[PDB]
Design a protein around this ligand. Structure first.
Ligand SMILES: Nc1ncnc2c1ncn2[C@@H]1O[C@H](CSCC[C@H](N)C(=O)O)[C@@H](O)[C@H]1O
Ligand SMILES: O=c1[nH]c(=O)c2ncnnc2[nH]1
Length: 241
C-alpha cells in the first residue's frame, strides 16, 4: 500500500493544506445530522472523518483502509482518545461485506480505483453497505480537472504529471509536506462515474461544488482561489438508492 510510505505525513498535510478546510466543510454539509446513525468510513486514513462523525453524535463508526500503516495510526488515535471506532485493513474494491449502514462516507476512495472495472466494483460495494434509506457521501477528483490549466500545489496537492490511462487519466502527485509525500491517483470521466453509480443501483446522485466562502476569499490574496474555482481538483458526490 502506497500510504505505508506516507503514514503520519498525511496528517501533516491535512493540517497545512488550504484545500482541507474547504473539503471538510463541504463533506459535513453533504452529511448533515449523524445523530444515532451507523456509519462506514471508507479509505478512512487515520480515521479523520469517521472519528469526527462519531464526535458529532453517530451511534457506531467502522473504518476501512488498504494501508496497514494508516490503520495502525487510526487504531492508535482511537486508543489515545478512548473512542469505540473499529478499523479493517481491506481493499474496498474487494471488501468482504460489512452489512448495511445508514451512511457511507468515502473521502478520497474512488480516485484510487485503478480501472473503470474497479471503480464500478467500489460503487457496488458501497451500495451493498447501505440500508434502503441510506446514503453515500463521497469526495473525489473532479473529472474536469486538467493539469495544464493550473496545478494545485498552492492548495496543498502538487500534481506532478498527467498521463492517459485507458479511458481516464493517471496522476502522480505529492502532498505538500516536509518531505513531500508521493502518491498516485486516477481521474475517471463523469460519464464513467455516473454509469458506475447507475449500475450499482443508485437511482439518485448529485455532484457537489466545494463550499468556498466569503471569509476564505477575504483572508488570502485576491485571485488566490482562481485555480480552485476554474480548475478544481476536487468534487463532492452524494448518492442514494
Ligand atoms: N482500494 C482502496 N481501498 C481502501 N482504501 C484505499 C484504497 N486505495 C487507497 N486507499 C486509502 O485511501 C486513503 C486516501 S487519503 C484520505 C484519507 C482519509 N479518508 C481522509 O480524508 O482523511 C489512503 O489512506 C489510502 O491508503
Ligand atoms: O486527502 C486527499 N487524498 C487524495 O487522494 C487526494 N487526491 C487529490 N487531491 N486531494 C486529495 N486529498
Amino acid at each position: 500500500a502506497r500510504y505505508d510510505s506516507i503514514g503520519g505525513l498525511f496528517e501533516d498535510f491535512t493540517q497545512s493544506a488550504a484545500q482541507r478546510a474547504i473539503e471538510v466543510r463541504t463533506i459535513f454539509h453533504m452529511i448533515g445530522d449523524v445523530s444515532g446513525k451507523s456509519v462506514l468510513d471508507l479509505a478512512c486514513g487515520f480515521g479523520f472523518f469517521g472519528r469526527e462523525i462519531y464526535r458529532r453524535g453517530a451511534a457506531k463508526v467502522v473504518g476501512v483502509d488498504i494501508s496497514e500503516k494508516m490503520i495502525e495510526l487510526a487504531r492508535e488515535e482511537s486508543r489515545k482518545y478512548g473512542d469505540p471506532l473499529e478499523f479493517h485493513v481491506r481493499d474496498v474494491a474487494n471488501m468482504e461485506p460489512l452489512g448495511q449502514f445508514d451512511l457511507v462516507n468515502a473521502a478520497w476512495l474512488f480516485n484510487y480505483a485503478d480501472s473503470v472495472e474497479n471503480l464500478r466494483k467500489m460503487f457496488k460495494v458501497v451500495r451493498a453497505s447501505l440500508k434502503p434509506d441510506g446514503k453515500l457521501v463521497a469526495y473525489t477528483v473532479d473529472p474536469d480537472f486538467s493539469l495544464a490549466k493550473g496545478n494545485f500545489a498552492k492548495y496543498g496537492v502538487n500534481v506532478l504529471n498527467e498521463r492517459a490511462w485507458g479511458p481516464g487519466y493517471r496522476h502522480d502527485a505529492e502532498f505538500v509536506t516536509d518531505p513531500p509525500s508521493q502518491f498516485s491517483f486516477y481521474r475517471w470521466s463523469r460519464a464513467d462515474y455516473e454509469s458506475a453509480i447507475a449500475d450499482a443501483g443508485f437511482s439518485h446522485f448529485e455532484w457537489q461544488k466545494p463550499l468556498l466562502e466569503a471569509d476564505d476569499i477575504a483572508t488570502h490574496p485576491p485571485g488566490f482561489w482562481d485555480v480552485f474555482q476554474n480548475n478544481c481538483l476536487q468534487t463532492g458526490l452524494v448518492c442514494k438508492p
